[PDB]
Ligand binder design. Structure first.
Ligand code: CDL
Ligand code: A1LZM
Ligand code: A1LZM
Ligand code: A1LZP
Ligand code: PGV
Ligand code: PGV
Ligand code: PGV
Ligand code: PGV
Ligand code: HEC
Ligand code: HEC
Ligand code: HEC
Ligand code: FE
Lengths: 346, 62, 268, 275, 318, 63, 63
């Protein structure tokens, strides 16, 4: 049971039903979850480089000592949780014995990449927000909305037996608690062969001799991913669509376009940054998923049931040390749409 | 409840019933024997999965 | 206006062509249903209250009035709908009313007492004057004094002897017996003795439990006095469809004519 | 132009409001004052629909819509080009539906029949009123009510359903779809039964109520009967309209998340199986 | 107020009627007729006897086999936990084959169980339809109820078999699940444009909304005219009474036209059975002839065009 | 049991057995198709084609 | 139990028992199908093929 009033956002023409209702009491109850911690004061760029006053500093080498300490303290406040410095550090602070140390090194690289390359298309839609460690982790070692491959895609299939739901027909937040395919996050936010443009076009709306569409199962998977998108942003389908015409981008609110990039960005995050971490993890780590996979990034990982992560708090100027240099060959169409050039390993 | 059929009517019904039941039964036994000789229905302790016996290039739906 | 092989050309596609075919079938189906509608009351008759004569060709023929349908009945009779006895009954129906105005569509105000006029809500159709039987030739609508096998269920009030009150609360009578439908297993009528016996249709009777714990029948349609004018049964122990129809029509007459007010609006 | 038996019932009286001035018939239609007001509201509302067709240059019954004002408009009167025409037509539709139901009350009084038909129509009217008033009151503006377009109100239904992600899973939608399907199922069964009794194979006599009772007793073990089938049918259709009221008044006002998430919120956590 | 004919305040019970004589009725009519007083409030109290025919018994058995196949699959899907079956009752389903099989019957757990259950359920539904026909015929009735069920079953076979076969893929068929078949609704409508733009969807909803309209109006009409024994409609058809006259005149004075006691049932019968028929037409054209109902209705000036958005979303993939 | 027709309607029994055997023939044929080994429609090889010894059914074979 | 048919209808008893045993035969065959060990259509190996000794049922074996 919910209750009026609601924060309403009319995302389309009047009378079309294109609007989003957001519960103010629910956002108030999730205020602790949806607000980043108070930022530390800005650190000066003048001083000895962190790679000179510390033995094993590579990713943050170009940082000043003060900026280094600021970002280290913030990362402790964002990912370490109640473990503090020991979360990633042994007694020796220059030793990468814990997988958390090296994973956090790759995570600093990934956050820099995201703030340098995905800000123009996705991470600064409303505010110059970008992402920090807290955007996904929310103060915890494991991002609460990190996802693993479902414990049905990795299991051995009893092909002639009973009870195979085909990654559907089960309760899952990954599909916004629909019976839609639960491996849609793997299909689209990791895999690149998945087709999200499932709505038929034809010619004149007709299955012309040249008309080839997607299967109904592909429609199931895409609608499941879209359920995940709606769940993650705490909005309905109308946030990014006149549902009457899903294929029509001209009839869709601007948030669809950025959502598109988010899809690709998630793929980027999962393909070039999250999955290659499996080497760093221990073979029998309890953090790994049932299929022995590292938790991937979905829409919900940053949009923890929120339209814009951390209430769109600005971090690009606030944490320049988490903003890297733009990738010279960055292209949002090279993540499974115009090609797979920027998805390393696939 | 009583069907009202006489003993002779019940006996001709049962003659036909025995004919149909046992003819279908024998035909089905022959059919199952033929299908069993074609491929025994029940696997041995080794099983009869292709993955356990066929080379790797023999695709198995299992 | 491209060709869309094999799905058509321009808008001449098979989405729209199955649409057109189904609308053609739906139009034919509506025409068929309208013809079936015209099996009663058709051919239409113009309003006799008219300063002009009747046009030679009458309304209600765009879907043609179909050939009369033949029904074979259990009693061996072959009836033809529209049943001409009903049509002649309507033709020769005593009105006891005059049009309010000289134009067609004018309502009929009854000349005298509208309870006895059998006009409007008191109007009734011509029906069979032989009592209807069940499939086993048993009297279909029968009092429980004859059909002793039928009983009021334990959880429900047995109103034999219960008071029957009229619109104004006056004592119309007492329930002598309950008439049930053998086929429907429902109460059709309450036989109400008046201190002579009349019948009270079950839908015209409200079995109300008084706060005394005493059950009574409240009859909103007619008053206690008007119970004396309910059409009687030709045979006390059986009712024909015609008598059922007369009694129900009398109570329907009461629904509009029992008291002077109920035929008048809130604000005229 | 009048049924063979119609004149026998065409009497004065039975008006709720109108007296004898409006108490007449034009052709088959009884008029009454509520018929006059129903025609007024209907024709004026259709003229406002045509006005929107003119100002929007949309002379297509399918593409033309009178949409309610924007959400930011609230309950304010809108410009006729910004939802005011929808407000006028909403008043017209409420008035026309109420006048039609009241004319049916008048006709029922004149025929001595019960008011069940105007009551059922009033249940449908109650859906329309609670959808076009109750939903604006719950959500804070006329813009949350559905628009007046043959196809465009389907788009509104689509978008309002997809606002809660998967509208099929709505409890009121599940109940009401079951009720519509049961209503069509029971109408098919009932029409089929009555026609089967009165239209057996050629040469067979018309069957009875005993025949239809034993037909459904043999068929499904229970026969609801002549009275029971009509009571159940009125109940099924009415209850589906009440389910429509609850669905249109709860999606958004009483659940802004997905109805899948609504089902997940309680059903899997029911303690008899949440362990 | 007046009695509203909503509930039977006083129920009368006769001897439990076993039923009119039919061939095989003495044996195949089973169950001591039980009287439900709660059911007697609305309609007939008598429950039973039911005809234990060959088609009826084997159709019920096949329905049970289908339901138990579905339940066993749900159990095996939740590790044979009845607790988890009930916890996930609405989500769980016997899923259809994936598209890579096309029309091939796949292994059980790759949609083969769905096709197995489809065969069992379809055969059981056909045996139940045969029971409908034969129960009508044994009583000397028309087979109108059987043909209404035939319209519903034709739509069912379009949903499950005929249209998946015409499309050439079993994944187009309806999954056997509470929430899964609603997800099939969503997937079909959105994959093939939008069924809101499907005119056979429009007509089927018109006929379903009008089944509700006609059956509300007709039940209300019969309850209103029950003062004149209009609920005994067979008599009002063969021997037209004042109740049927008043019903016709109510609807003629309201709408300008009416029905008869028989023709209102013709109207309702056709309005109901048209829902699955034009439903089957529209669903079948979705995926065989029509790829997008939105694009098709755009070509036919059926789909509304709304105000162009300020700052529309532009497809980043051109 | 020739006396069964004194108490069981043979018409029901025979017609119902025919209906249930149509249903069961579909069920069993579909079960065979759903099996790789027994899907003659797909025609997969038998493991006996690749086994050098007879697997048996009750033969107490060991790896 | 020969007097049971004085009080219990053998019609419904026999019909319901045949219907229930058809349903139960399907249920039991489903239970076998769902079992890797017992699915003959899958044809999975028995674990006894790989055990070096008799597992028993009540044998009270120890690791
Ligand atoms: C319009 C077309 C319908 C009416 C014409 C017609 O068919 O024949 C009548 C008549 C023929 O007279 P006739 O030849 O003597 O009698 C034969 C009749 O045809 C037939 O006589 P009848 O007695 O048999 O019937 C009387 C008539 C009287 O009633 C009507 O005329 C009302 C009709 C309403 C139709 C609504 C359709 C909605 C869609 O009713 C009908 O004929 C209607 C039957 C068909 C109804 C279908 C309903 C279901 C449709 C949906 C599908 C359902 C499928 C279910 C499954 C199966 O022709 C005319 O008078 C034409 C007049 C046209 C007037 C147009 C007015 C337009 C609006 C004006 C706006 C401004 C007004 C301002 C006024 C202000 C001051 C007051
Ligand atoms: C995505 C999204 C979606 C959706 C959406 C949604 C929302 C939002 C909603 C809804 C609804 C529902 N639906 Mg649906 N859907 C889906 C689907 C479906 C299906 C399948 C198959 O799938 C099915 C079967 C279904 C059905 C249903 C039902 C039940 C309901 C409807 C009905 C109504 O309402 O009307 C109701 C209505 C009413 C009552 C109406 C009334 C008039 C008025 C007075 C009268 C007068 C008028 C006039 C004009 C006059 C004329 C003249 C002449 C002509 C001269 N679904 C999807 C999913 N949904 C509602 C509710 O809730 O209920 C519960 C709401 O709200
Ligand atoms: C792959 C493939 C396959 C098949 C095939 C087919 C088709 C297609 C069909 C069939 C059938 C039929 N089968 Mg057969 N099968 C199969 C197996 C079997 C079995 C097992 C054991 O496994 C059985 C028992 C059967 C049986 C039968 C019957 C019951 C029916 C009828 C026929 C007759 O009569 O015969 C006749 C009869 C007969 C053959 C039978 C008798 C007793 C015997 C001596 C003894 C018993 C034993 C046991 C159970 C235990 C052992 C096992 C273990 C594990 C060692 N099937 C496979 C799996 N199919 C049909 C039907 O359903 O009808 C409706 C059809 O259509
Ligand atoms: C639970 C019970 C139910 C029930 C019951 C029942 N409905 C009855 C009766 C009974 C007992 C009648 O007795 C009465 C009658 O005479 O015909 C049989 C009637 C009727 N309903 C009609 C339409 C109907 N009803 C539907 C639903 C149910 N109807 C539910 C299921 C549905 C849908 C969508 O499901 C439809 C389209 C007409 C044909 C007729 C009214 C005419 C009128 O209002 O006059 C008035 C005359 C006219 C011409 C009205 C015009 C008024 C405005 C200004 C015109 C503009 C129209 C709108 C703004 C509406 C929104 C447009 C949409 C595109 C968004
Ligand atoms: C067919 C079966 C399919 C689905 C049925 C599922 C169970 C229905 C539950 C209805 C009540 C839950 C809604 C609720 O509890 O929502 C509350 C608000 O509900 C409201 O305003 C409306 C108040 C409730 C109205 C109905 C009672 C909160
Ligand atoms: C269009 C509506 C369908 C046509 C119709 O209204 O009914 C038609 C009458 O056409 C006619 O006068 C013409 C009636 C409709 C013509 C005008 C339609 C558009 C205007 C409304 C046909 O009805 P029947 O005479 O019973 O047919 C007898 C059948 O054996 C052969 O047809
Ligand atoms: C107990 C019942 C008493 C009778 C009902 C009384 C209700 C209203 C009578 C109001 C009298 C005239 C007042 C006119 C004031 C107009 C200026 C204005 O703007 O006042 C509006 C008054 O609404 C309004 O006239 C509402 C009226 C606008 C007409 C809309 C027509 C469409 C519906 C027709 C229904 C016909 C029945 C207030 O709406 P906003 O504050 O913008 O809403 C913002 C939302 O977030 C809610 O907080
Ligand atoms: C499961 C219900 C449908 C299957 C029919 C089985 C009914 C049980 C039954 O048939 O048992 C009968 C007694 O039933 C009784 O009292 C109680 C049963 C009364 C008849 C019920 C008929 C089905 C009604 C469904 C609605 C046994 O008596 P007969 O053999 O008649 O002699
Ligand atoms: C994981 C998320 C970490 C937390 C929490 C903290 N530290 Fe860390 N630290 C981490 C990495 C991956 C690195 C390497 C940085 C690089 O650019 O490669 C570091 C680095 C340091 C260093 C310098 C290492 C050296 O060469 O001596 C120090 C001194 C250090 N970190 C201290 C430190 C303290 C005090 C923390 C708690 C407040 C802390 N770190 C948190 C990973 C993580
Ligand atoms: C979202 C895009 C993320 C941002 C931004 C950062 N991290 Fe992350 N991190 C993310 C995921 C999905 C995961 C996997 C969680 C799982 O389920 O396994 C991680 C993992 C880490 C870890 C290891 C967690 C553990 O196993 O204990 C660390 C130490 C970590 N991330 C650190 C980290 C830092 C320091 C970041 C900012 C510079 C950072 N992450 C950003 C998702 C995202
Ligand atoms: C973290 C790395 C993110 C992931 C993964 C996804 N999104 Fe995102 N999104 C993120 C940020 C930091 C922002 C900017 C917030 C701001 O205030 O500017 C966004 C923005 C959006 C928006 C626009 C929201 C708005 O301002 O109206 C949308 C619609 C959106 N994101 C959708 C989206 C989807 C659909 C994703 C998964 C496929 C997704 N995002 C992933 C951070 C991150
Ligand atoms: Fe009826």
């Amino acid at each position: 049971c919910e209750r009026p009033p609601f924060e309403q956002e009319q995302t389309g023409p009047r009378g079309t039903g294109m609007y989003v209702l957001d519960n103010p009491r629910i956002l108030e109850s999730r205020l602790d979850l949806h607000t980043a911690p108070e930022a530390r004061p800005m650190a000066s760029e003048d001083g000895e480089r962190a790679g000179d006053v510390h033995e094993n500093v590579q990713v943050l080498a170009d940082l000043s000592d003060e900026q280094f300490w600021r970002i280290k303290e913030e990362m402790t406040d964002w990912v370490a949780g109640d473990e503090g410095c020991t979360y990633c550090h042994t007694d020796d602070l220059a030793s990468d014995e814990k997988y958390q140390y090296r994973v956090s090194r790759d995570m600093i690289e990934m956050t820099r990449y995201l703030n340098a390359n995905w800000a123009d298309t996705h991470l600064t839609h409303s505010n110059e927000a970008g992402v920090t460690c807290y955007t996904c982790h929310r103060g915890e070692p494991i991002p609460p909305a990190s996802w693993h491959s479902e414990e049905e895609s990795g299991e051995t299939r009893f092909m002639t037996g009973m009870g195979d739901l085909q990654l559907q027909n089960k309760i899952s937040s990954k599909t916004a608690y629909t019976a839609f395919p639960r491996d849609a996050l793997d299909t689209f936010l990791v895999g690149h062969e998945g087709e999200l443009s499932i709505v038929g076009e034809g010619e004149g709306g007709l299955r012309t001799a040249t008309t080839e569409g997607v299967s109904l199962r592909e429609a199931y998977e895409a609608v499941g991913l879209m359920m995940h998108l709606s769940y993650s942003l705490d909005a309905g389908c109308t946030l990014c669509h006149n549902v009457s015409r899903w294929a029509s981008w001209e009839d869709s609110p601007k948030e669809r376009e950025t959502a598109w990039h988010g899809i690709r960005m998630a793929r980027d995050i999962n393909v070039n940054w999250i999955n290659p971490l499996i080497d760093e993890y221990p073979e029998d780590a309890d953090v790994l998923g049932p299929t022995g996979d590292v938790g991937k990034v979905s829409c919900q990982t940053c949009h923890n049931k929120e339209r814009r992560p951390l209430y769109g708090e600005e971090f690009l100027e606030l944490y320049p040390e988490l903003v890297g240099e733009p990738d010279p060959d960055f292209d949002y169409l090279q993540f499974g749409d115009l090609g797979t050039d920027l998805l390393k390993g696939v | 409840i009583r069907t009202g059929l006489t003993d002779e009517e019940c006996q001709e019904i049962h003659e036909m019933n025995m004919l149909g039941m046992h003819a279908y039964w024998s035909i089905g036994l022959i059919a199952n024997a033929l299908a069993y000789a074609w491929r025994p229905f029940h696997q041995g302790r080794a099983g009869n999965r292709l993955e356990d016996h066929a080379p790797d290039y023999v695709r198995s739906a299992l | 206006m491209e060709a869309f092989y094999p799905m058509g050309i321009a808008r001449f596609d098979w989405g729209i062509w199955a649409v057109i075919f189904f609308f053609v079938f739906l139009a034919g189906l509506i025409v068929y249903c309208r013809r079936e509608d015209k099996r009663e009351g058709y051919p239409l008759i113009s309003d006799p209250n008219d300063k002009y004569g009747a046009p030679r060709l009458v309304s209600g023929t765009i879907p043609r009035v179909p050939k009369p349908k033949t029904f074979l009945l259990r009693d061996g009779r072959t009836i033809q709908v529209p049943r001409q006895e009903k049509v002649e009954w309507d033709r020769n129906y005593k009105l006891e009313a005059q049009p309010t105005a000289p134009w067609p569509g004018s309502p009929l105000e009854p000349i005298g007492n509208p309870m006895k006029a059998a006009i409007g809500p008191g109007a009734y159709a011509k029906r069979e004057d032989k009592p209807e039987l069940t499939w086993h030739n048993k009297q279909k609508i029968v009092p429980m004094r004859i059909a002793t096998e039928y009983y009021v269920v334990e959880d429900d009030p047995d109103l034999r002897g219960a008071p029957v009150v009229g619109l104004c609360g006056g004592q119309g009578g007492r329930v002598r017996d309950i008439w049930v439908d053998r086929s429907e297993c429902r109460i059709m009528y309450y036989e109400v003795e008046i201190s002579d016996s009349v019948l009270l249709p079950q839908c015209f009777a409200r079995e109300t439990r008084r706060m005394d714990g005493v059950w009574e029948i409240r009859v909103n349609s007619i008053t206690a006095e008007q119970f004396r004018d309910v059409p009687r049964l030709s045979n006390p122990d059986q009712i024909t469809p015609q008598e059922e129809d007369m009694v129900c029509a009398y109570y329907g007459a009461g629904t509009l004519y029992a008291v002077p007010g109920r035929t008048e609006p809130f604000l005229p | 132009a009048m049924l063979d038996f119609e004149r026998k019932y065409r009497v004065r009286g039975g008006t709720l409001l109108g007296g004898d001035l409006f108490d007449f018939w034009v052709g088959p239609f009884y008029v009454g004052f509520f018929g006059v007001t129903a025609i007024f509201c209907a024709v004026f509302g259709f003229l406002m629909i045509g006005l929107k067709a003119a100002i929007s240059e949309t002379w297509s019954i399918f593409q033309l819509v009178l949409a309610p004002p924007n959400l930011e408009n609230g309950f304010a009167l809108a410009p006729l080009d910004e939802g005011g025409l929808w407000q006028i037509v909403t008043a017209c539709a409420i008035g026309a539906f109420v006048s039609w139901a009241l004319r049916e009350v008048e006709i029922s009084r004149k025929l001595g029949i019960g008011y069940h038909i105007p009551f059922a129509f009033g249940v449908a009217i109650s859906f329309f009123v609670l959808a076009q008033l109750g939903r604006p009151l719950l959500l804070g503006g006329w813009g949350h009510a559905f628009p007046y377009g043959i196809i465009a109100h389907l788009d509104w239904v689509n978008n309002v359903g997809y606002q809660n992600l998967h509208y099929h899973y709505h409890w009121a939608h599940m109940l009401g779809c079951s009720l519509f399907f049961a209503t069509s199922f029971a109408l098919a069964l009932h029409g089929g039964l009555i026609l089967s009794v009165t239209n057996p194979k050629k040469g067979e006599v018309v069957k009875t109520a005993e025949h239809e009772n034993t037909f459904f007793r043999d068929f499904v073990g229970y026969s609801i009967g002549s009275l029971g089938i009509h009571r159940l049918g009125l109940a099924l259709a009415l209850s589906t309209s009440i389910s429509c009221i609850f669905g249109i008044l709860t999606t958004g006002p009483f659940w802004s998340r997905g109805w899948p998430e609504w089902w997940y919120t309680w059903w899997p956590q029911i303690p008899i199986w949440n362990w | 107020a007046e009695y509203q004919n909503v509930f039977t305040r006083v129920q009368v019970r006769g001897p439990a009627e076993q039923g009119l004589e039919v061939p095989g009725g003495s044996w195949n009519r089973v169950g001591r007729p039980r009287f439900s007083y709660l059911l007697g409030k609305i309609g007939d109290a008598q429950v039973g006897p039911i005809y234990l025919g060959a088609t009826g018994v084997v159709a019920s058995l096949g329905f049970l086999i289908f339901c138990l196949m579905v339940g066993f699959n749900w159990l095996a899907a939740v590790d044979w936990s009845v607790r988890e079956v009930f916890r996930q009752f609405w989500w769980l389903a016997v899923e259809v084959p994936p598209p890579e099989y096309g029309l091939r019957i796949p292994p059980f757990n790759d949609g083969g169980w769905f096709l197995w259950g489809l065969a069992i359920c379809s055969l059981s539904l056909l045996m139940w339809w045969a029971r409908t026909y034969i129960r009508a015929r044994a009583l000397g009735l028309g087979t109108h109820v059987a043909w209404a069920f035939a319209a519903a079953l034709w739509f069912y076979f379009i949903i499950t078999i005929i249209r998946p076969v015409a499309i050439g893929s079993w994944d187009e068929s309806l999954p056997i699940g509470m929430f899964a078949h609603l997800d099939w609704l969503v997937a079909i409508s959105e994959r093939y444009g939008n069924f809101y733009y499907n005119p056979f969807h429009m007509l089927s909803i018109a006929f379903c909304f009008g089944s509700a309209l006609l059956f509300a109006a007709h039940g209300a009409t019969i309850l209103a005219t029950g003062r004149y024994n209009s609920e005994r409609e067979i008599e009002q058809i063969t021997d037209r009474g004042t109740g049927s006259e008043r019903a016709a005149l109510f609807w003629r004075w309201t709408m300008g036209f009416n029905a008869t006691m028989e023709s209102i049932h013709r109207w309702g019968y056709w309005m109901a059975i048209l829902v699955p028929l034009v439903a089957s037409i529209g669903l079948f054209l979705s995926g065989t002839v029509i790829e997008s109902w939105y694009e098709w209705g755009l070509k036919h000036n059926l789909v509304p065009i709304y105000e162009e958005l300020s700052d529309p979303a532009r497809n980043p993939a051109a | 049991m020739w006396k069964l027709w004194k108490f069981v309607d043979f018409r029901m029994t025979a017609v119902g057995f025919h209906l249930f055997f149509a249903l069961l023939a579909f069920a069993v044929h579909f079960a065979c198709i759903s099996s790789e080994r027994f899907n003659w429609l797909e025609g997969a090889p038998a493991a006996e084609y690749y086994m050098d010894e007879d697997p048996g059914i009750w033969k107490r074979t060991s790896y």
